[PDB]
Amino acid sequence: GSSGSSGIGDARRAKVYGRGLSEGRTFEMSDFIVDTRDAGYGGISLAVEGPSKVDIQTEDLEDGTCKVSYFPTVPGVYIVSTKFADEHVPGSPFTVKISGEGRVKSGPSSG
């Protein structure tokens, strides 16, 4: 059997990359990958604190990593509390600045 002895890891080893870790936008599904296979084992705690409540969907991928997904409804600063085995990843918390309407640019050049 696979399950057995405790394989606790180290957050410092856990890696996080994607789009919902740096920037983001309102009413836009922003998820990211969480590399834990390189760290080891342990319980992962996720908590987003922003200007409003946002759903959080997680799932175990084939690679062994976890992909978090959320849907912001209000623009502001969403604090993504990423923890692993009772240890915050090397760089947390994750301050994700969400931008509302007003695309980066519309078209200052006719055509």
Evaluate whether 90 touches 84 at the Cβ level (below 8 Å): no
Q: Which amino acid, 10?
A: D
Tally of structural domains, the chain: 1
DSSP code at position 40: -
CATH classification of the domain holding 48: 2.60.40.10
- Which residues, in sequence order, are bridge partners of residue 80? 48, 94
**107, part of any domain:** no
Distances (CA, A) of 29 to 42, 55, 62, 91: 27, 10, 22, 23
- Tokens, residue 21: 């870790």
DSSP code at position 60: B
Evaluate whether 19 touches 68 at the Cβ level (below 8 Å): no
- List CB contacts of 81: < 8 A, sequence separation 6 or more: 45, 46, 47, 48, 49, 88, 92, 93, 94
**1, part of any domain:** no
Q: Which amino acid, 92?
A: S
d(CA 105, CA 33): 29
SS3 100: coil
DSSP code at position 91: T
Write the Ramachandran bin of 20: left for phi over 0, alpha for psi from -120 to 50, otherwise beta. alpha
Count of residues making up the chain: 111
Evaluate whether 24 touches 96 at the Cβ level (below 8 Å): yes
What is the extent of the structural domain holding 87?
Answer: 7-100
Way the structure was solved: NMR
- Tokens, residue 7: 């394989």
In what order do the strands lie in the sheet containing 56-57?
A: 15-18, 30-35, 66-70, 56-57
Paired sense of beta strands 56-57 and 44-49, if any: unpaired
d(CA 60, CA 101): 33
**111, part of any domain:** no
**87, part of any domain:** yes
